Design a protein around this ligand. Structure first.
Ligand SMILES: Cc1cc2nc3c(=O)[nH]c(=O)nc-3n(C[C@H](O)[C@H](O)[C@H](O)COP(=O)(O)O)c2cc1C
Length: 167
């Protein structure tokens, strides 16, 4: 399996614990981890990607991702296999839960990438959503406020699934 590039951002550090969990499930696999507050340049260097963002400002990604969306779109994603992870709060944001991964998704598929790791919408409460395609969420959706006890298995199952598609 080619080395996995893990890219995240965080405001209040919740995402740091989620990244640590991803890294734990990749304990036997080569990965490298980057905080996109330091830019997105290195996304170019990996064939396998895990892009992680908490949700801010009505369904947006963290500002460090938003500020780099033009740079991200400059990257050629052809032949890359990408899993997306959002963190959000589904009851406080009934219309924008984990909406940040939509900004990443649209760029990855536009630039030739393959997005993997769609997840079931069962077990979530939402009034509206912008992160569904084909009846599933376009990535892994985590809610540490309301469903922290589901996060470890949600991540472990997801990592098992996307590793089957990874190069
Ligand atoms: C100002 C603010 C806006 C937020 N907006 C959303 C949102 O639109 N959708 C969502 O699902 N969660 C939203 N959240 C919840 C966060 O995404 C969630 O608490 C996450 O765990 C924060 O991760 P972090 O500690 O790594 O920054 C918001 C939180 C704050 C403080």
């Amino acid at each position: 399996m080619k080395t996995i590039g893990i890219f995240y951002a965080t405001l209040t550090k919740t995402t740091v614990g989620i990244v640590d969990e991803i890294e734990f499930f990749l304990k036997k696999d080569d990965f490298k981890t980057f905080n996109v507050k330091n830019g997105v340049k290195e996304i170019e260097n990996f064939e396998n990607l895990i892009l992680v963002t908490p949700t801010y400002q009505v369904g947006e990604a963290h500002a460090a991702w938003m500020n780099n969306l033009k740079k991200l779109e400059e990257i050629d994603f052809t032949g890359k296999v990408v899993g997306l992870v959002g963190l959000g709060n589904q009851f406080a944001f009934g219309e924008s839960f984990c909406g940040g991964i939509r900004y990443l998704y649209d760029i990855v598929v536009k630039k030739g990438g393959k997005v993997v790791g769609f997840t079931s919408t069962d077990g979530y409460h939402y009034e509206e959503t912008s992160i569904i395609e084909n009846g599933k969420f376009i990535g892994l959706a985590l809610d540490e406020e309301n469903q922290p006890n589901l996060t470890p298995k949600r991540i472990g199952d997801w990592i098992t699934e996307i590793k089957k598609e990874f190069k």
